[PDB]
């Protein structure tokens, strides 16, 4: 993984790796940006043993975390509408939600 | 590869390649999309003799293609302004534009 | 649906559907066929800790069930080589891969 | 509908369909496909008043179409000897015939 489509998820162990750095949906619904081993972000919401948790891309750009039974955890609150956005995991550290196709090969 | 942060790009013979599909600035200035071995989309820029082109995506949202000493070969125009832009070869084939940050997390080294 | 044409895929919680029977990839890794309600063949995979994967008909004849961004949990080895392949689920049950066209009207779209 | 296996077939009127698009035996004894109501393929064996045919897929891997009796009008020639196939009309609009089987569950 690296990018995260519309509409794309992170189950609970899943993450995006690129480098050092990995962005992890962890055993409890807690997602955390770590610089080798040392957490640098993370969404603070974490509860041992709460597993079962989901980390999706919504198609109005919103990028939230859900309980196993369906609740949001917590959301990025970027939802700009309908449209096609992607989640990446860059180079240089960070988490960059690009929205909205500027062009496209058909 | 598989995707091109804004100011980066394809030299002459690079390629991003997301398995069946791909995408590469051949050595005779022609971008082509590939689909397992069968050309999909072209730039249409393999001028005769023409040699040494570039695959450029910008700060202003443009994907441009050059080849001796700047001079625009073909360029998407999708110049939407100066903002933060990626170009991805997709799991599904089609390569698009993202535009500009709607939210990231501030980690950057 | 009730078809897959040679590279298409089922994804977590997708299915084919005939008459009372059903082929569907649950949450788990499991593949299971149902007669509505019983299950009456298996891939095999309800694995502790293994969710969302996709069973996928391969260009090669094969069929496998592929982990979340992993390897071969299950295959039918029915690998022939590359072709036109398509696996149907019959209403007489039984689900089929056949191997490549022998005859065609020609008329791509 | 739009399979047809080993020993399966079109009567006059009968047909096989996926969206816009339309795989018939006509009372004209014409097997056609129409794109709505454009044609697009046919066997050009028609005869105004030549009805009863049928359409039948079989063992040797043979689409033939006959006569109110029971003789041969046309036939695709896929004869490769005694097996199992399916005739599939595909979401792009194009008609197939598959060379046996080489897998099944039960
Ligand atoms: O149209 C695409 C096609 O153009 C030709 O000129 C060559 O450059 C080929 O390599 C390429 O696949
Ligand atoms: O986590 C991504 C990135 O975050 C920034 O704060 C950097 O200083 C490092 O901590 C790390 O490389
Ligand atoms: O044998 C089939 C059976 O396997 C179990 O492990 C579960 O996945 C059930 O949902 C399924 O019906
Ligand atoms: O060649 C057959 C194919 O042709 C296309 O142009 C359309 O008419 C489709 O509806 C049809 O399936
Ligand atoms: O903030 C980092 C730290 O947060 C919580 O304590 C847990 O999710 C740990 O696994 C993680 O290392
Ligand atoms: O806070 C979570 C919530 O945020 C916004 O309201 C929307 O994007 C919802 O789809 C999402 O579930
Ligand atoms: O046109 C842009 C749009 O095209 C297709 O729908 C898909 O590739 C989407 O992922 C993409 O965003
Ligand atoms: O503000 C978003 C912006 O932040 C930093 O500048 C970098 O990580 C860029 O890649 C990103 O687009
Ligand atoms: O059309 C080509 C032209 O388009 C915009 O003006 C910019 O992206 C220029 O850099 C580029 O040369
Ligand atoms: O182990 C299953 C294996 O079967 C065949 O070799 C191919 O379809 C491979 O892609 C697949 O991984
Ligand atoms: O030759 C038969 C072949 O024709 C085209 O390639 C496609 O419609 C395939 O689906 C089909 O199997
Ligand atoms: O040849 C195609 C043409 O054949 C006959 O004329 C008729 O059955 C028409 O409906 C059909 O479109
Ligand atoms: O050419 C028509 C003829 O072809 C093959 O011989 C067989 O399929 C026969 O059943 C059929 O009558
Ligand atoms: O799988 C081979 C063969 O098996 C059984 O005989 C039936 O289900 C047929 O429809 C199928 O073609």
Redesign the interface.
Not at 11 to 14: I, T
Not at 92 to 106: E, F, K, L, P
């Given at each position: 993984?690296?990018?995260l489509?519309n509409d794309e998820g992170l189950?609970?162990?899943?993450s995006l790796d690129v480098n050092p750095y990995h962005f992890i949906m962890q055993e409890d619904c807690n997602l955390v940006?770590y610089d080798h081993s040392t957490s640098?972000?993370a969404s603070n919401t974490g509860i041992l043993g709460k597993k079962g948790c989901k980390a999706v891309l919504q198609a109005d750009?919103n990028?939230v975390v859900y309980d196993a039974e369906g609740r949001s955890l917590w959301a990025?609150?970027?939802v700009?509408g309908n449209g096609?956005?992607?989640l990446?995991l860059?180079e240089?550290?960070?988490?960059?939600?690009?929205?909205?196709?500027?062009?496209?090969?058909?």
């Open positions: 993984r690296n990018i489509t189950y609970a162990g899943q940006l640098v972000w750009g990028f990025s609150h970027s700009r096609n956005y992607v990446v860059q240089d550290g960070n988490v960059v939600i690009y929205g909205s196709d500027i062009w496209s090969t058909n």
